[PDB]
Curated annotation (Swiss-Prot), chains A, B:
It comes from Mus musculus. Induction: Induced in stimulated quiescent cells. The chain holds residues 115 to 171 of 284 of the full protein. The molecule is in a coiled coil structure that is formed by 2 polypeptide chains. The sequence exhibits a prominent seven-residues periodicity. Belongs to the tropomyosin family. This is Tropomyosin alpha-1 chain. Residues 2-22 are annotated as: Disordered. The sequences of cardiac and skeletal muscles are identical. Binds to actin filaments in muscle and non-muscle cells. Plays a central role, in association with the troponin complex, in the calcium dependent regulation of vertebrate striated muscle contraction. Smooth muscle contraction is regulated by interaction with caldesmon. In non-muscle cells is implicated in stabilizing cytoskeleton actin filaments. The gene is Tpm1. Homodimer. Heterodimer of an alpha (TPM1, TPM3 or TPM4) and a beta (TPM2) chain. Interacts with HRG (via the HRR domain); the interaction contributes to the antiangiogenic properties of the histidine/proline-rich region (HRR) of HRG. Interacts (via N-terminus) with LMOD2 (via N-terminus) and TMOD1 (via N-terminus). It is found in: Cytoplasm, Cytoskeleton. The lineage of its organism: Eukaryota, Metazoa, Chordata, Craniata, Vertebrata.
Amino acid sequence: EAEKAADESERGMKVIESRAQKDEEKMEIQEIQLKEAKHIAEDADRKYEEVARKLVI
Amino acid sequence: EAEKAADESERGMKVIESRAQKDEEKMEIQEIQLKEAKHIAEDADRKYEEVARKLVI
């Protein structure tokens, strides 16, 4: 009985760990995309303010 | 042997569940901030285009 319980717990542990690792990898990719979005936002903001100042002059 | 295996399996399942929930939260917040940043980027690009045209005029 104990052997059966241990094997079932082992299988559940392995599958849940695999799914967690894959979702963690995708989360890392999402963070990379967020960083790129941050950079794009900052660059565009600088563009806009510079152009507005030049237009005023 | 079975007792020790069961204890280790329980601890591993606990830690994997905690890490999985952490990953889900990180994925959610990453997606939210990503969408907000993309919308801000769209707004900035539109403003840049409009002010550039006015500047040429």
